[PDB]
Amino acid sequence: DYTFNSTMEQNGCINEAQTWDSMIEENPDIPLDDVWGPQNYRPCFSYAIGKPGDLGQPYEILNYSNKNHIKWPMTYAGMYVYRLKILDPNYSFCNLT
Amino acid sequence: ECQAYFRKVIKSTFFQIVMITTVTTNSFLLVLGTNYDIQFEFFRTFEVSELFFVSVYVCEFLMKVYVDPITYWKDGYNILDVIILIILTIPYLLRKIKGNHSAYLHFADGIQ
Amino acid sequence: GCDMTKKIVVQNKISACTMGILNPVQLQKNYTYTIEKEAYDDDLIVFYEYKDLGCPRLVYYDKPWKPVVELWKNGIVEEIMNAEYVISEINGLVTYSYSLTAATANCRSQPQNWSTFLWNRENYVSCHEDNKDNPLLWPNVEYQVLGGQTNNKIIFGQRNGIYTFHLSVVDPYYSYCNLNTIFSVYVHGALPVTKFQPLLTILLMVTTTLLTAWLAYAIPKQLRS
Ligand SMILES: *[C@@H]1O[C@H](CO)[C@@H](O[C@@H]2O[C@H](CO)[C@@H](O[C@@H]3O[C@H](CO[C@@H]4O[C@H](CO)[C@@H](O)[C@H](O)[C@@H]4O)[C@@H](O)[C@H](O[C@@H]4O[C@H](CO)[C@@H](O)[C@H](O)[C@@H]4O)[C@@H]3O)[C@H](O)[C@H]2NC(C)=O)[C@H](O)[C@H]1NC(C)=O
Ligand SMILES: *[C@@H]1O[C@H](CO)[C@@H](O[C@@H]2O[C@H](CO)[C@@H](O[C@@H]3O[C@H](CO)[C@@H](O)[C@H](O)[C@@H]3O)[C@H](O)[C@H]2NC(C)=O)[C@H](O)[C@H]1NC(C)=O
Ligand SMILES: *[C@@H]1O[C@H](CO)[C@@H](O[C@@H]2O[C@H](CO)[C@@H](O)[C@H](O)[C@H]2NC(C)=O)[C@H](O)[C@H]1NC(C)=O
Ligand SMILES: *[C@@H]1O[C@H](CO)[C@@H](O)[C@H](O)[C@H]1NC(C)=O
């Protein structure tokens, strides 16, 4: 139960992106740290790579120059200890979390 | 001679019921014709029904081609319906089988 | 010589997808379409590729249409393309006519058509010069060249299917680069005709004869009463 600012579209994603739930579905048994990262990243603004899927699901590749804020359900109160990880495959040589 | 029997037949409610049924099926054809699928596909029913309708309207004009146009030239509703038949028959005669020089389509739903 | 950074693109401002005919989410998985025996002589079929083409353009039957092509340098729009260009079919269909046939285009040197053999910047000699030994054998032979100073377009047929236009820029004074592209269009007409030799007048005469036969049958009904 957590969502964000926007969807596939209104961010420029021409073709289908890759979201967190789909990627947790992608990897059956290995923990999350080896699920998604800079070794696996494929951009959405591609028009040739992965998928012409339906657009409008929540978009979690959030970055600057993008407004993408975080959102949680209003009703119940809780905490979600988020660890932030950088996804760009040619930004730096090391891991930054 | 047989004009009395013909006028008796034209006074019968069954012929008018058949006419009303045919033109109500024409109304349903127009209802399905404003769509795009039945406009040109799954349209053999459209073809045969339209042939039936134009046959019926030609028959109606044959009933109204009598000497009664001595009353279909001064009256009210009567001139309206025969003129409606004329402005029906001429365009689709030059539209369904056109083969002519004309600009485009703007009188299909109008004719219906 | 040539400038390899230049390319030609066809605008796809509104495409046939994202409306009530076809969706982008499906076409990539072998969305094969039909040909109704009009290309050369049978069971020809066509295989669209979404990745290579995209969502095809959408036009209507009996609409004078011209593609508008833009020039791109380093991935940037810079200028629309106004030179003379020609189109052809890779599959080889003939169910599309052309506009005004070169006499109202004020041609004077017997233009060549898609029958001399591919066109390029090399083979093409125009007909708007004043060459002195082929003025005409031509009342109304068409003018298979779009663009330029002339204003001829392509009048579409009633096939209601996808078309793959192979476009070649044909002017030999624009650039040395043999500009060429492939794009896709789709037509959505009004009505196919299966009337055959029975005419409206023929069926009208048949109905009049049948109704007169019915009247001749109903005359004894009054006679017997
Ligand atoms: C931070 O996050 C933001 C968004 O959240 C990112 O901004 C996005 O950056 C993308 C690229 O860096 C932009 O992607 C688009 O890609 C299209 C490529 O499509 C081509 O199409 C031709 C057709 O002939 C093909 O041959 C090619 O192979 C490609 O497939 C471009 O067309 C597109 O250019 C324009 O985009 C605007 C939208 O702003 C359209 O309105 C316009 O019509 C045109 O298509 C663009 O390059 C993406 O638009 C952009 N999004 C936003 C909202 O800015 C940042 O990149 C992220 N930060 C970092 C550092 O990565
Ligand atoms: C493509 O262009 C060539 C010209 O290089 C066209 O050939 C010429 O076409 C005209 C018009 O059809 C011919 O003139 C007439 O031919 C008919 C016979 O079809 C004849 O009865 C008339 O009296 C008159 O001569 C002309 O002869 C012909 N030239 C040659 C050398 O064949 C060709 O028709 C064009 N094709 C298309 C598809 O546009
Ligand atoms: C996501 O929610 C935020 C609210 O925090 C919206 O952010 C605004 O974005 C506009 C667009 O430039 C700015 O002018 C505002 O200053 C922003 N306000 C705040 C509080 O951040 C953003 O519009 C939302 N995204 C979408 C797609 O609706
Ligand atoms: C469609 O083509 C692709 C690639 O050519 C192939 O993998 C797929 O099996 C084909 N599907 C059908 C139904 O022919």
Residue B83 Cα distances to B60, B64, C61, C152, angstroms: 13, 11, 32, 42
**Residues of C whose CB is below 8 A from A17:** none
Query: What six digits make up the tokens of C151?
Result: 């204003």
Rounded to the nearest angstrom, the distance between the alpha carbon of C99 and the centre of ligand 2 is: 18
Q: How many CB atoms lie within 10 A of CB C222?
A: 15
With a CB cutoff of 8 Å and minimum separation 6, the contacts of C160 are B40, C61, C187, C188, C189, C192
Burial of residue C137 (number of CB atoms within 10 Å: 0-12, 13-18, 19+)? exposed
With a CB cutoff of 8 Å and minimum separation 6, the contacts of C94 are C38, C39
Query: What six digits make up the tokens of C25?
Result: 């989410």
Experimental method, per PDB record: cryo-EM
Q: Are the Cβ atoms of A52 and C54 closer than 8 angstroms?
A: no
Backbone angles phi, psi at B68, to 5 degrees: -60, -25
Q: Which residues of B touch C (CB under 8 A)?
A: 2, 4-6, 9, 36, 39-40, 43, 47, 51, 54-55, 58-59, 62, 92-93, 96-97, 104-105
Q: Which of C24, C151, C207 is nearest to B58 (CA)?
A: C207
The CA distance from C68 to C83, in Å, is 11
SS3 of residue A94 by DSSP: coil
**Residues of C whose CB is below 8 A from B62:** 208, 211
Name the amino acid, one letter, at C32. Answer: T
Q: Are the Cβ atoms of C218 and B105 closer than 8 angstroms?
A: no
Distance from CA of A53 to the nearest CA of C (A): 5
Rounded to the nearest angstrom, the distance between the alpha carbon of B2 and the centre of ligand 4 is: 72
Nearest ligand, measured from the Cα of A15 = 1
Q: Are the Cβ atoms of B96 and C215 closer than 8 angstroms?
A: no
Query: What six digits make up the tokens of A68?
Result: 């993408």
Burial of residue B61 (number of CB atoms within 10 Å: 0-12, 13-18, 19+)? middle
HEC string of chain B equals CCHHHHHHHHCCHHHHHHHHHHHHHHHHHHHHHCCCHHHHCCCHHHHHHHHHHHHHHHHHHHHCCCCHHHCCCCCCHHHHHHHHHHHHHHHHHCCCCCCCCCCCCCCCCCCC
The CA distance from C101 to A89, in Å, is 58
The CA distance from C60 to C186, in Å, is 8
HEC string of chain C equals CCCCCEEEEECCCCCCCCCCCCCCCCCCCCCEEECCCCCCCCCCEEECCHHHHCCCEEECCCCCECCCEEEEECCEEEEECCCEEEEEECCCCCCEEECCCCCCCCCCCCCCCCCCCCCCCCCCCCCCCCCCCCCCCCCCCCCCCEECCCCCCEEECCCCCEEEEEEEECCCCCCCCCCEEEEEEEECCCCCCCCCCCCHHHHHHHHHHHHHHHHHHHHHHHHHC
Query: Does chain A reach chain C with at least 3 CB pairs under 8 Å?
Result: yes
